[PDB]
């Protein structure tokens, strides 16, 4: 193809490098030694991958996702397999909305696109819930992605959770709450990963062309970020990988993306919006202020 500019000589200030890939929950780690280092490591590996991208050394999004995974893996451990494996279609992916995701609860309850449904549970019964349903549109067809659930009948919950503990046992209850916690995220069905990965490859292929306005480039990057994160392709570490890939693509063009603002967790911000919506706000999620 045609070599790109590659990472810029003018680098981010060190305190920003140390915030790359951080998870700055508005309700809370990013200041710790190990996280600063982890973030500076990500910033550096992104530039390394960027150099390669600019030279035509990484020809597929899958290849780039592979580089991101290798990096994240070197930062690890029995959970190794989870961070290294893709999600298989014979499974479901669920993230309970518990620490450190508490800030998400409110984001779902007060979301403009949220609605009230009834969530039947063979233990708690039918529960009233605020529901946000992330969907995407590819090739003319809707494809449901992540679904957020937050139960409102709190009182009933705390009391009922109690009786169950003693009736079924903590062990069994936890086994159940781990998958069907009243407040949780049911992630994009693994069955869509094949079609989505192919799409990510087309976005990548386009973001690798040397003739694009900066604006177009940023939007392409925000899109790629949205798809990669919302799809949550791997069993573990998808957010980290999605951000790595986005930044790398940017770095390959000489763009030095700043860290995400405090309070803005990129993957969560993505799962809470539609594609265009996220693309239009992407810039504002990034801390690009001088002072």
């Amino acid at each position: 193809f045609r070599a790109l500019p590659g990472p810029s000589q003018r680098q981010l200030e060190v305190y920003d490098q140390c915030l790359i890939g951080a998870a700055r929950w508005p309700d809370d780690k990013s200041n710790t030694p190990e996280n600063r280092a982890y973030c500076q490591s990500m910033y550096n590996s992104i530039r390394s991958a960027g150099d390669e991208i600019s030279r035509g050394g990484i020809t597929s999004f899958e290849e780039l996702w592979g580089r991101a995974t290798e990096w994240r893996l070197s930062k690890l451990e029995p959970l190794y397999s989870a961070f290294a494996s893709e999600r298989t279609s014979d499974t479901d992916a669920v993230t309970p909305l518990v620490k450190p995701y508490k800030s998400v609860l409110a984001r779902v309850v007060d979301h403009e696109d949220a609605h009230d449904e009834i969530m039947q549970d063979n233990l708690f019964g039918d529960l009233n819930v605020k529901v946000y349903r992330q969907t995407a549109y590819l090739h003319g067809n809707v494809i449901p992605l992540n679904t957020f659930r937050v139960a409102t009948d709190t009182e009933y919950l705390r009391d009922r959770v109690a009786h169950l503990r003693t009736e079924l046992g903590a062990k069994a209850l936890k086994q159940h709450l781990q998958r069907y916690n009243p407040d949780r995220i049911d992630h994009t069905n693994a069955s869509y990963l094949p079609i989505i990965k192919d799409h990510l490859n087309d976005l990548y292929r386009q973001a690798i062309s040397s003739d694009l306005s900066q604006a177009e480039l940023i939007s392409l990057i925000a899109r790629t970020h949205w798809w990669a994160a919302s799809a949550m392709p791997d069993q573990r570490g998808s957010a980290a990988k999605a951000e790595f890939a986005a930044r790398a693509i940017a770095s390959a063009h000489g763009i030095e993306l700043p860290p995400f603002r405090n309070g803005n967790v990129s993957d969560i911000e993505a799962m809470l919006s539609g594609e265009e919506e996220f693309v239009e706000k992407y810039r504002s999620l990034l801390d690009s202020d001088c002072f």
Binding site: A82, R87, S89, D90, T91, D92, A93, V94, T95, P96, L97, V98, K99, P100, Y101, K102, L105, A106, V109, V150, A151, T152, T154, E155, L157, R158, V161, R165, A170, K171, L173, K174, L177, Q178, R179, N181, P182, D183, R184, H187, M232, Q235, R236, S238
Partner: peptide, 23 residues
């Protein structure tokens, strides 16, 4: 209180993405 219903719950769910076999 939207998630404080499981106060001091010994069986609380762990805060991260878990995978399960499709039923």
């Amino acid at each position: 209180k939207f998630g404080d219903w499981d106060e001091n719950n010994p069986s609380s769910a762990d805060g991260y993405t878990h995978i399960f076999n499709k039923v």
